[PDB]
Every structure is written in structure tokens, then in C-alpha cells.
Subunit: 91 residues, 4 copies
């Protein structure tokens, strides 16, 4: 089974099991989008570098999302401990 | 800023300190995957070798992103339920 | 301020609005208990009839105070446990 | 069984079951204390009124303690709901 995605004005026929089609298609869409932004600036010159840079930003995006989530959890933990102290001091 | 080596080319990205090791690990993946694809000869052109590799890591990351989001909304619910029980106990 | 009638004498106390009915209920108890004790003849002297009645309601209140405190520390613990489980779920 | 408490410089022999001795003794102690404060001011003249006034304040003390506790619970409930909203908006 072949999936044919379009990434940055070029075509790719990838042997993909029906199982992963949607996943691969959105991954391609996501990569395409990120490559379009990068290309539409000028810092990166070279179609191969654009792709590599995109993969690195996508990697950053996800690492940062996890960092933000971890911070969000830790914070509510601090607030929960603040609640606990209020409870111990008066009730 | 971090400077990584991917398939005989240098890339310099602005990564917040705590991401360095993960980004390096990413680059290492990229480089390896590109050499593998290049060696297969199934994809012609450095730009195409680059996106096939980039598509590969993006697909990987989104899968990890899902499992993350799974665990994430899961604890968001246990926490919501617990706080709810706290409210009720206080009424 | 509230003005109550207890065993043919008026008392005026400064009660925060929400207590009026409960304080009136208290006075009603006092008056009834004093008439009962006075009628028994077992206690001689209005001052002694007064404290025996006052001791009676005080004893009553402390019992209610205990049951209150019981329920109170009980929910203070369920709440503490729940918040604790919330903290753990967030780690 | 007779318990002999002292309340405001006078003695009282009360038929009290061993079961309630401690309770009755602290109630007497509590009443005595409250009657001493009241007498040591001047607003109330008359040993019987002093006792009645004391029972009313003791009643107030307890009504107010319960009001304060209810307020304390309601408040932590508001804070818990504030926590819940934080959770729903980001996590």
C-alpha cells in the first residue's frame, strides 16, 4: 500500500500500512507547514537544510510543550500544598 | 544556541539549555536515518533524502506526542475527580 | 442586641443577627429548666437555681461541642487525604 | 454518686453518674470561669443574672465557633474550585 503525500511542492510515495495512513499524512502536513515557515524567511538556504531545520524545530516544539506541561503540573502541586497548609492551620 | 552535525553539515539552533541533550539525540537520529536512506538508493536527491528522514522523525515524535497526551489527560481526570471529592466533603 | 425573657427577668445581649433564633431557643431552655429546678425545691436560692440551670445547659452544649468537633476533624482528615492523593497524582 | 463542684465561691453536690463526672467537672469549670469574667466588670448585678448571662455567652461562644468553622470550610471550597478552574484551563 502506497500513500502519496506532498511535502514542499514535491511528491512522495511511501509504502505505508493502512494502519499508519492518517498518522503519516498529518505528520507530512505538519512537516510541510514547518518547512514552509522556515523557507519563507531566508535564514536557511538549501532544500535539504530546510527539511533538517524543520525536524529540529518540530523536535523543539514538542520538547517545549512537555517542559511547559511539567511546569504547569509542578505549579498546581505548589498550590495544592498551599491548600494543605491552610487546612492544617485551621479546621 | 546549539551546533549539531547532521550528515556532514552543521546546523546551529537556539535551544533552551534543558533541551540540548534531547536535540543532540534528535540530530543523531536524523544523521543515521539519512545515511540509511541514502544507502538504500530508493530516494534520489539530498533534499528528498532530508525530508524522508525529517518525515520519519516527525512521525515518530507525533506517536510519542500521542502517548504523552494520553497520560496527560489521564492524570488531569484523576486530579479533577479528587478535587471534586474534596469539594463535596466540604459541603 | 437581643432581649430575652428568662424566669421573669429580662436580659439584653449583643448577638450577631444569625444567632438570634438559637439564643432565643437557649433562653427558652434556661427558663424552663429553672422553673423545673425551682419547682423541685431541691435547690434553694435564685442564684443557685440559676447556676444549676446554667451548669445544665453548659453541660449540654459541651456534649454537642464534642460531637461537632468529632465530625469536624473527621472531614478535616478526608480532605487532607484527598489533597494528598492529588499531590501524588501530580508528581 | 455525688460530684461536688465549686462554682463562683459556692458548692454544689450533684448526683452524677461516674460516666459524666469529667464532663460535668469541666462544664462547671467553664461556667465558673465565664461567671468570674462577667462578675469582674459590673454590667451585671445579681448572682442569678450573672449565671444566666454566662450561659448566654457560653451559648454565643459555641454558636460563633460553629459560624467561623462554617466560613472556614466555605472559603477553602472556593479555593478548591479556583484550583479546579486552573486545571480545566491548562493541563
Amino acid at each position: 500500500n502506497t500513500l502519496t503525500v506532498q511535502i514542499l511542492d514535491k511528491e512522495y510515495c511511501i509504502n505505508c500500512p493502512d494502519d499508519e495512513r492518517a498518522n503519516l499524512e498529518s505528520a507530512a502536513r505538519y512537516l510541510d507547514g514547518k518547512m514552509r515557515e522556515i523557507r519563507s524567511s531566508g535564514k536557511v538556504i538549501g532544500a535539504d537544510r530546510v527539511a533538517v531545520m524543520a525536524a529540529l524545530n518540530i523536535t523543539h516544539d514538542l520538547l517545549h510543550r512537555k517542559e511547559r506541561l511539567d511546569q504547569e503540573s509542578s505549579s498546581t502541586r505548589e498550590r495544592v500544598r498551599e491548600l494543605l497548609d491552610r487546612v492544617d492551620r485551621a479546621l
